[PDB]
Every structure is written in structure tokens, then in C-alpha cells.
């Protein structure tokens, strides 16, 4: 009786949200960006090849200096690369080799990683001893760790496969806030530029926007037909893009509270593993299961170019903070750095 | 045209490769096994004979280091993280023979044996295990023999038309699982009969992994 009545009210609320989104859907992003000229053909060459990973690479993250980056592979090795010289600055042996994510602290003093071991390990990069040591192990998630991102040296947000996201106090080792509401495994998260909000994508084909300080879900974005594997904030923080197993990439807007554009092609039938934006946001780079990395025009939903230099699934990619270069990681155990030429 | 400190950084990087190579080769000669199987399927009994989220167990048998990974605590969707094990030497699959006349605790209408058969073909025919040999364990062999006399196998398999004895009913179930192999060319299924007091459970995995190692060597050497 009471349960039946309540679940009917939920359907009415869902219809109210759908009607509200339809009310503000006066125009289409495709119509708005029809007049602007296309980016043309985007040709990028492999300037550097980072060798040394001996297994599938699952994650990489640039440092804030736009020169150092950290990558994680399932050979049980965390490697920090000097992209200018291809020198390896550090090699961090991971206690658990089944790593799925890695993060570079904005200060550059810490890195984080975690996978099927349900643990977020914090590594100190600036020690008087000259070696990287574990400073914290963040326990509390009941599923695998899918993504993690530092806000500063003391706060980090992690998404897990136990359907929850958490905000951690690194000094005390306790999760100050727990973000609940996803009905599937959360696969990725992206921090807003001001680090006051973050979005997460789960396997329930939905993306939720979370308030870091308040600790509740502000908005939920649906529209995908399969599990969401990747998510990335737009450089201004007012939008984010996702990549799913349905061979589509979608750009969601926070303020419009609905999907704006889908990035898919009929030839593409493989899942998407990673997404990132260029500094201006004009290019959306997505890694695919078909061994390629496609650079998309975010505004016009056109495939601007292809990075084809890997013999297995492109599992991760990232764009520098200054926009100078893009790194792509793949299951073929190689990292490649791309940029154009005059 | 490198400065005196840039050249020293390069020498540091080559010292890291000297240690990546040392660790990468040590990991290449070790055996990675994915331990799969359902609730009360004997999965934990096998671990009891070979002594967070994922439970990794190491053991040494005849100068060979095995890494057996138990993912029973991962309640998430299997298809998401299963690709992380693409490249394991073999998969150890535990099936309870006695769970043929029983039904699932939750469903209360789906047979336990049919659940494993659906689980087996979801793993055997998985795209990441295309050329990954599977070690199929048929546990509780002794308890199955007692239960055949009372409960006939026709409850689980209507198409069965055979003798009510262990030596014929068990072989029918054994070939039913091996029949689920949708690609009998790129992979093999190794089937073994364990028990609660057996001492040949680790030997079978050692033998089955050895045949997988030979197969992998032939591909690398170009003979295959």
C-alpha cells in the first residue's frame, strides 16, 4: 500500500524532470555550432614512445608542470616519466599489481593508485630519503577502485565499483564524506577546475554530479545504453563528457542538466575506455577497443583525427594542463606522446 | 648537446630499466591462475590444500611459482574487471557434482548445476579467454556417488537416458561441461576429479599449467 504509492510518486517526479529538460530544449547544440568552421583534419605524430611497461597499461596522469606524468600498468609498476627526455624519474613498485587508476597530485609531491584490491595507496614523491614511500593506504571501499583524483595534498576523491564515491582526509586516513546513490559500479570520476564539484559515471549508464563540501548528489545524467567507463570535466567546469561500452561518447552539461551531443560512428562498435579534453576544449580525445584513439570535435561531433600506433586496446589518455601534448596508454604496454607540426 | 646534469638524468633512467627488466623477467616465468566458481562450489576447499577485495595466494610446487587469484568477494559486474586477467596461464574452475539435484538458495527455482553450466560457458566462451586453457574441477565426487543412488540424474538432465551409476552419470556431466567449449581449436579444457582427502589436486594443476606453458612456447618460437 504505502510502498506502491511511493513508487508511483517517483515516476511522477521522473516525468517532471523529463518535462523540465524538454521545456529548456529550445535548440540543439548541432544547430548552434553549424555555422562555425570545422577543425579540418587533425594529424598528430608520435614524438616520444615511452617503453618499459611489460604488461597492459591501464591509467596515466599528467603532473601540473606539464612535463612529468605518472602511468599505471598491470606489470605491478608505477612509472613517472620525464616526457621531454623520455627519462624515467621514478619507478614505484605497487603492492597489488591489479591497478586500474593512477593520479598525480597538483603539488607534484604525491601519487595515488588502486584497483581490485579496494585500496587507495598514497606515495610520497618528495622525501629526504630520495625514494618514493607509501604514506597512506585509504581503506573503506567494498569494491574495486576505478578512479582517483587529488584535490590537494590532504584531500582526494575516489570512485569504486561498490557503487559509492568517497572524499578522503589523507592525514587521518578516514573518509570524511561518502557519496552514495549509484546503482552500479562507478568506473570514473573527474574533478572540476575549482575542486568544489566532481562528476562520476557508473555502470548503471548514469552520471551523477556531487558537491564535495555538502556531500550529496546534486544532479543525475542518464542517456547511455551501457556501462560508462570514462568521464572528464570540460575545462571551464560547466560540462563533462563520458565514454561507454555502447561505442558512443556523450557530452553532458551541468547547468542544462541533460545530454548535449553524442560522439559515435557506425564503423565504431567497440567500447570506449578513456576521455580527455584539450586546453581550449575544442578537441575531445577518446580511446577505443579497436586499437585506436580518435580525436573528436566536441562542438561538431566530427572525428577530427586518429592516433593509430598501438597493437591493443587504448586503455587511457590524457592532455597536458597547458595543452602542449597528449599521452595515450594502451594494453600493448606502450605510451605515445602526440602533437602537431606547423 | 646535453648538459652535465641532463646526461646524469639519462643514466638514472637506464638504471630504472635495469630494474624493470629484472622484475619483468621474474614476472614472466611465474604462473598466474584465475580461481573461479560459485557459492559452496568447493572454491575455498582448494585454497585450504594450497597454503580486502581480491585475495592473492602464492605457493611453490616443483620449482614453479603460482599466483592464484580469488575474486569471490568482488560482487560487482564480472564483465568489467574480468579483462584485467587477460593473460593468465590458466583458469581453475570449481564445480560441485553433488549440486545437481539442489536449487539455488535465492532463486529457489533454478538448479545449481545449470547455474554453473551457464557460468562455465560465460567464462569458457568469453572473448578475453579465447586461448586460455581452463582447469575444470568436479568437486564433491564422493558425495555425488551417494546421492545418485537416492536422487536420479534425470531430475537435472531430462535428456539423460543412462545407467544409475557413478561411472556413467559422472562422465555424462563431465562431457556436458566440455561440450560447452564453443571453440575446440584454440583452447583446451582440463578436467580433474578432486575430493576432501585428495593429494593430487595440486599435481593436476601443475601438469595442466605445464601443457599450457609448452603451448605458449610453441607460439613464441614460431612452431605453432
Amino acid at each position: 500500500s504505502e510502498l506502491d504509492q511511493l513508487r508511483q510518486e517517483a515516476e511522477q517526479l521522473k516525468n517532471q524532470i523529463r518535462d523540465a529538460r524538454k521545456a529548456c530544449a529550445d535548440a540543439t547544440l548541432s544547430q548552434i555550432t553549424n555555422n562555425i568552421d570545422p577543425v579540418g583534419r587533425i594529424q598528430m605524430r608520435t614524438r616520444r614512445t615511452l617503453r618499459g611497461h611489460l604488461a597492459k597499461i591501464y591509467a596515466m596522469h599528467w603532473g601540473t608542470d606539464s612535463r612529468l606524468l605518472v602511468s599505471a600498468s598491470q606489470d605491478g609498476k608505477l612509472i613517472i616519466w620525464d616526457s621531454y627526455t623520455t627519462n624515467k624519474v621514478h619507478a614505484i613498485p605497487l603492492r597489488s599489481s591489479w591497478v586500474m587508476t593512477c593520479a598525480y597530485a597538483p603539488s607534484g609531491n604525491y601519487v595515488a593508485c588502486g584497483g581490485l584490491d579496494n585500496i587507495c595507496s598514497i606515495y610520497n614523491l618528495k622525501t629526504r630519503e630520495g625514494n618514493v614511500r607509501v604514506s597512506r593506504e585509504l581503506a573503506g571501499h567494498t569494491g574495486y577502485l576505478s578512479c582517483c583524483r587529488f584535490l590537494d595534498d590532504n584531500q582526494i576523491v575516489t570512485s569504486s565499483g561498490d557503487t559509492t564515491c568517497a572524499l578522503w582526509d589523507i592525514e587521518t586516513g578516514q573518509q570524511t564524506t561518502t557519496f552514495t546513490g549509484h546503482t552500479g559500479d562507478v568506473m570514473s570520476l573527474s574533478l572540476a577546475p575549482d575542486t568544489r564539484l566532481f562528476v562520476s559515471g557508473a555502470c548503471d549508464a548514469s552520471a551523477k554530479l556531487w558537491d564535495v563540501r555538502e556531500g550529496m548528489c546534486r544532479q543525475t545524467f542518464t542517456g547511455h545504453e551501457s556501462d560508462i567507463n570514462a568521464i572528464c570535466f570540460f575545462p571551464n567546469g560547466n560540462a563533462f563528457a563520458t565514454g561507454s561500452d555502447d561505442a558512443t561518447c556523450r557530452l553532458f552539461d551541468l547547468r542544462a542538466d541533460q545530454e548535449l551531443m553524442t560522439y559515435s560512428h557506425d564503423n565504431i562498435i567497440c567500447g570506449i575506455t578513456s576521455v580527455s579534453f584539450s586546453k581550449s576544449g575544442r578537441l575531445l580525445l577518446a580511446g577505443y577497443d579497436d586499437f585506436n584513439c580518435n580525436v573528436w570535435d566536441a562542438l561538431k561531433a566530427d572525428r577530427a583525427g586518429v592516433l593509430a600506433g598501438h597493437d591493443n586496446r587504448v586503455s587511457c589518455l590524457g592532455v597536458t594542463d597547458d595543452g602542449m601534448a597528449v599521452a595515450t596508454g594502451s594494453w600493448d604496454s606502450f605510451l605515445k606522446i602526440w602533437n602537431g607540426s606547423s | 648537446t646535453l648538459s652535465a646534469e641532463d646526461k646524469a638524468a639519462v643514466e638514472r633512467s637506464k638504471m630504472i630499466d635495469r630494474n624493470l627488466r629484472e622484475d619483468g623477467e621474474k614476472a614472466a616465468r611465474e604462473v598466474k591462475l584465475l580461481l573461479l566458481g560459485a557459492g559452496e562450489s568447493g572454491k575455498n576447499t582448494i585454497v585450504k590444500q594450497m597454503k580486502t577485495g581480491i585475495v592473492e595466494t602464492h605457493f611453490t610446487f616443483k620449482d614453479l611459482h603460482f599466483k592464484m587469484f580469488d575474486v569471490g568477494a568482488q560482487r560487482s559486474e564480472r564483465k568489467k574487471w574480468i579483462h584485467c586477467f587477460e593473460g593468465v596461464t590458466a583458469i581453475i574452475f570449481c564445480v560441485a557434482l553433488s549440486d545437481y539435484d539442489l536449487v539455488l538458495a535465492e532463486d529457489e527455482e533454478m538448479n545449481r548445476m545449470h547455474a554453473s553450466m551457464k557460468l562455465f560457458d560465460s567464462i569458457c566462451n568469453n572473448k578475453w579467454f579465447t586461448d586460455t586453457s581452463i582447469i575444470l574441477f568436479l568437486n564433491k565426487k564422493d558425495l555425488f556417488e551417494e546421492k545418485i543412488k537416492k536422487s536420479p540424474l534425470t531430475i537435472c538432465y531430462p535428456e539423460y537416458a543412462g545407467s544409475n551409476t557413478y561411472e556413467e552419470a559422472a562422465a555424462y556431466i563431465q562431457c556436458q561441461f566440455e561440450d560447452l567449449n564453443k571453440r575446440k581449436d584454440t583452447k583446451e579444457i582440463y578436467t580433474h576429479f578432486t575430493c576432501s582427502t585428495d593429494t593430487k589436486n595440486v599435481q593436476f594443476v601443475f601438469d595442466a599449467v605445464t601443457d599450457v606453458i609448452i603451448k605458449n612456447n610453441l607460439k613464441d618460437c614460431g612452431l605453432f
Epitope: 608542470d65 612535463r67 612529468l68 620525464d82 621531454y84 627526455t85 627519462n87 624519474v89 621514478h90 607534484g108 629526504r128 630519503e129 630520495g130 625514494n131 | 648537446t1 646535453l2 648538459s3 652535465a4 646534469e5 641532463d6 646526461k7 646524469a8 638524468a9 643514466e11 638514472r12 637506464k14 638504471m15 635495469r18
Partner: single-chain antibody, 231 residues
């Protein structure tokens, strides 16, 4: 804590041999390159030898090349300097200096206490030998180099050290602008080409001492004469 204890020094006959040891504790010794720097009595610092991380690269000063041998024992975390045919010119305090090399590292950040030995090329110029100073007043120290220290990679390999009376040298500024760990923010390094300035705002009693500028653009590493601050 990070420690570097030197031993083996003492009074030796001319033409003799002596073995200097540098024991390292509290840090990853095998990950750090090591330098020997000596200081003659009432004189400035003088670089002796260098061994790289992994022992692949070894450098010697011209005045000691062929007579001195530098070696390390990674399992024992000990650094060695084998000296032979010791002359009266070798009477000095020998300092053990650690230096690690990667992007953004701070070489020469920690120095040892030094050991005393008694026996019975880019030119770095610090013309101003002494500067009378008072606490709380701003002081600028100038350094000159015969060659331009700016490399094509954008780095300017100039280092500043402070040796307080009775104490080991301490790193202040590395690569001509960066501030070393544990050094107060009042120190600031500014320079261009061959002329460099070290600005010390709100000078304090601890800042009193001799300041040395060293170049790391190329080997051999050469030191300036040194600028002394006195009250």
C-alpha cells in the same frame, strides 16, 4: 635522520697515502650521486671527484686525476676516496656531498661534516672578500663566471652555498633561482648570463657566514673565492 660521517683523516707524511670514507645513513645511498669537495685551511671549497648513480660515470679533478680514486659500496652504504702520493697541497677538510639527478631535483642539498687531512676550467670570481653587515638589513652578493652558465635547456646551473663558522656548507639556491629544502624564504637568487646576485631580505644572525657560488654547467666543477659576511 640524514647523516654523513667522514673518517680516515689525520696527519700524514708527504708522498704518503690515505683512505677517506663517507658512511651514509637515513637515505637511499644507491640512488644518489656522490661528490667529494675539499676546503684548504683559510681557503675556499675545491671539488675533488664525482661518481654517478649506478657507478657508471666517474670524474676527477685535474689537480688530483691519476692520484685519487673514488669508489662506493652500495650494500654497505659507504663512499670511498682512495688518495695516494699525498702532497702538502692536499692538506684540507674533505666534505662528502650527496647529489641526486632527475627533473626538478635539488643536487648538493646535503653536505657531510667533513674530515681533516694534514700533510707534514670555468673561472668563478667573487671579488668582494668581505662585507660588513648588520642584522635586519638587506644584503646582495655578486658572483661572476668566465663562461655563460645558461644551457640550451633553459636551466642556469649556478649554486649558492653558506658555510657558517664551525659548520658544514649548506645549500641555499640550486639552479640559480630555486630555494633548497629547509632554507628560509628570505634568500632569493637572481642572475643573468655570467652575472648573478643573491638577495637576502631581513638578514639575521644565522645568515652570518661565507657564501660560495659554484657552477654545475659542466665538469670540472669550480668554486668562487667566497664572500664573507661579518658583523
Amino acid at each position: 635522520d640524514v647523516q654523513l660521517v667522514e673518517s680516515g683523516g689525520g696527519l700524514v707524511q708527504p708522498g704518503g697515502s690515505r683512505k677517506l670514507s663517507c658512511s651514509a645513513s637515513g637515505f637511499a645511498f644507491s640512488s644518489f650521486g656522490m661528490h667529494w669537495v675539499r676546503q684548504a685551511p683559510e681557503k675556499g671549497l675545491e671539488w675533488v671527484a664525482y661518481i654517478s648513480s649506478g657507478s657508471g660515470t666517474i670524474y676527477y679533478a685535474d689537480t688530483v686525476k691519476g692520484r685519487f680514486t673514488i669508489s662506493r659500496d652500495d650494500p654497505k652504504n659507504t663512499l670511498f676516496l682512495q688518495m695516494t702520493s699525498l702532497r702538502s697541497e692536499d692538506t684540507a677538510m674533505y666534505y662528502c656531498v650527496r647529489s641526486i639527478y632527475y627533473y626538478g631535483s635539488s643536487p648538493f642539498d646535503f653536505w657531510g661534516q667533513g674530515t681533516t687531512l694534514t700533510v707534514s676550467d670555468i673561472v668563478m670570481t667573487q671579488a668582494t672578500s668581505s662585507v660588513p653587515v648588520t642584522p635586519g638589513e638587506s644584503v646582495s652578493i655578486s658572483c661572476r663566471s668566465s663562461k655563460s652558465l645558461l644551457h640550451s635547456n633553459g636551466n642556469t646551473y649556478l649554486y649558492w652555498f653558506l658555510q657558517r663558522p664551525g659548520q658544514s656548507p649548506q645549500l641555499l639556491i640550486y639552479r640559480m633561482s630555486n630555494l633548497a629544502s629547509g632554507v628560509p624564504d628570505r634568500f632569493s637568487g637572481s642572475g643573468s648570463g655570467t652575472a648573478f646576485t643573491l638577495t637576502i631580505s631581513r638578514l639575521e644572525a644565522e645568515d652570518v657566514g661565507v657564501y660560495y657560488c659554484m657552477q654545475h654547467l659542466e665538469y670540472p666543477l669550480t668554486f668562487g673565492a667566497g664572500t664573507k659576511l661579518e658583523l
